[PDB]
């Protein structure tokens with residue numbers, strides 16, 4: 001039913017007005033025909049009545065309805081980008097004196113928001129290994145207000161045992177706000193809110209947009225946390241432009257077909273790489289043997305196309321150029337989740353430096369691949385040519 | 392390698408300037424820094440130097456390069472929609488006293504262009520059965536200038552034997568302009584120019600855009616016909632806006648994954664319908680027994696999602712409402728090639744009225760389906776519920 005839901009989510013007649021897709025309603029000013037209409041709009045300004053562009057237009061309402069349906073939430077807040085969704089969703093729930101507990105595999109700018117912004121405002125941050133499971137109850141403190149998950153982890157792809165983590169957290173601090181950056185799953189391959197997580201955050205920038213040409217963040221909350229998220233994000237003025245909301249709705253429609261091809265192609269690549277003499281490790285959650293693969297097999301309904309692997313060596317600056325500069329199909333860039341295949345290198349010491357209170361367990365250069373929609377045999381030929389350049 | 396080509400076609404740095412996709416260059420005025428720059432631009436105004444917005448900006452040049460690569464042509468003209476591409480491509484090659492030979496299964500607005508616009512301008516049109524094959528030779532007159540193909544045919548979906556038609560035309564009138572409306576194949580399931588056709592026309596509106604929210608026509612010509620196409624369409628002011636050009640290039644990137652799903656689901660539905668006791672006949676190019684199926688299998692590399700079937704009876708007006716008005720997932724609308732599934736009905740005499748000099752061979756009500764990206768079992772249940780309403 002997912003593919004049918006993707007095609008139809010948010011597409012009601014009040015938003016589409018006769019077309020297949022929602023109209024694009026560009027607005028700051030939204031006009032009240034009468035004082036009664038203005039009173040009604042004011043009362044319902046956070047409940048889907050047209051009131052002011054910072055609250056949304058029809059185009060936003062359609063995307064929000066669609067995200068709430070797909071992720072099973074009570075509300076969806078929208079942000080200029082994925083990093084803004086993370087920073088402002090955390091900020092919405094903390095005050096001077098609180099404590100945040102975050103996986104040490106979190107996206108680096110999410111860590112930096114904690115250590116460079118929150119700290120100067122009286123909020124502290126501790127760290128945990130992605131595979132801590134139930135032992136996380138040990139780290140929970142009497143002022144721990146937020147617990148921040150990200151699964152798979154950034155770059156290294158380790159999957160949480162979320163059931164064990166949530167259960168442990170609910171024993172010790174039931175009213176803690178559990179959050180997850182659910183971007184790798186595109187919010188649909190892992191139903192975060194069905195696991196007891198309070199808020200699922202996405203860089204819709206990635207698979208939801210799907211084409212590397214829009215930036216937008218989303219946060220879908222359960223009924224318990226929606227109103228605080230919505231009103232505190234709004235006090236920071238957080239919103240997205242109507243056209244980008246439209247393009248996010250539009251990306252949903254092909255998300256199923258795309259993800260199935262990303263899953264298929266990338267698992268094939270990773271199977272070939274795990275057999276490869278020049279490869280030390282392969283970190284693909286759908287690959288038997290990867291850190292947390294068993295949780296992935298159990299808790300996820302599929303895979304996307306982003307993973308990583310470790311070379312037999314820490315490439316020099318000169319080897320890195322010979323390797324990366326001369327691919328024919330993979331491109332060097334940040335971001336991911338689009339139609340084209342990407343390649344990025346992180347040296348083991350660089351990873352270690354973004355793993356607070358941990359070290360790394362590999363010494364080769366770590367290559368992160370986004371596997372796009374190209375023919376997978378073409379892409380293997382490109383990686384093979386890459387290996388020949390550094391042998 | 393098609394999937395790799397779809398991902399990469401037209402995406403060169405002079406257009407993308409560092410992003411994944413081409414920039415969107417919106418312009419009428421294009422600035423000449425010097426008289427010499429203006430002279431150079433004038434000389435190359437049809438060859439991809441910036442000259443004037445009506446000739447195109449970087450965004451158009453990128454799409455044009457993509458289409459020439461994917462369809463194997465020398466140039467690609469752009470139009471406001473498919474119907475404009477058809478009308479203006481035919482018009483570009485005719486003059487008073489010329490004769491056009493068009494398949495009697497052509498899209499109805501294409502026929503009306505011939506009978507209502509060309510006729511009063513001194514250009515006659517004759518008609519042929521789509522399975523005529525080599526016998527088209529006998530219809531070629533001394534003044535026949537254009538032979539217009541459409542395979543599969545509109546609504547009824549008959550597939551031409553293009554090799555036999557092209558060989559027969561080239562025996563009698565080697566210099567005739569052979570055109571095809573290649574929309575059903577999205578220009579990539581049937582490589583028209585490789586079969587000796589001179590110009591491949593598409594409503595990029597359909598599968599190239601892919602989301603039912605842009606209109607655009609394209610015409611890719613071989614080297615023999617390109618300059619005449621280019622300059623006579625320009626004399627009629629035909630262009631597309633830069634944003635829709637961008638959206639067409641963008642659609643190309645997912646065309647492969649989308650078409651494979653349309654193929655799989657539409658063939659499933661067609662095979663199910665062919666077994667159904669309320670179905671007299673299924674018109675799907677990929678279904679055994681359909682008209683021209685053998686040519687589809689030999690000459691195409693796949694199928695899209697549009698096809699039709701004939702019911703075992705002629706629906707009354709009351710039955711038509713009962714059937715059509717109460718679908719849950721199929722929607723009634725014109726166009727096709729999007730993510731959502733569509734349904735339309737025609738009575739046999741309506742089709743007969745748009746089959747010039749021919750009758751139809753069925754008497755039941757005809758249903759045209761577009762199979763979108765929804766789960767095919769959901770779509771089958773929607774069709775079954777419809778059959779129950781008219782049984």
Ligand SMILES: Cc1ncc(COP(=O)(O)O)c(CN[C@@H](CO)C(=O)O)c1O
Pocket residue numbers: 081082083084107154181183184203204205206215216217333334335336
């Ligand atoms: C898991 C994850 N979460 C957030 C973000 C940031 O989203 P933006 O919309 O880019 O602000 C990312 C993005 N990471 C990309 C590019 O920043 C990367 O290459 O690491 C993300 O992966």
Ligand SMILES: Cc1ncc(COP(=O)(O)O)c(CN[C@@H](CO)C(=O)O)c1O
Pocket residue numbers: 472473474475498545572574575593594595596597606607608724725726727
């Ligand atoms: C085969 C074929 N060729 C051209 C067109 C016209 O394209 P536009 O971009 O709509 O001008 C079509 C479109 N016919 C659709 C939409 O009316 C239909 O419902 O039959 C076409 O099929």
Ligand SMILES: [Cl-]
Pocket residue numbers: 043
């Ligand atoms: Cl109130």
Ligand SMILES: [Cl-]
Pocket residue numbers: 045052055
């Ligand atoms: Cl307000």
Ligand SMILES: [Cl-]
Pocket residue numbers: 436443446
């Ligand atoms: Cl000119």
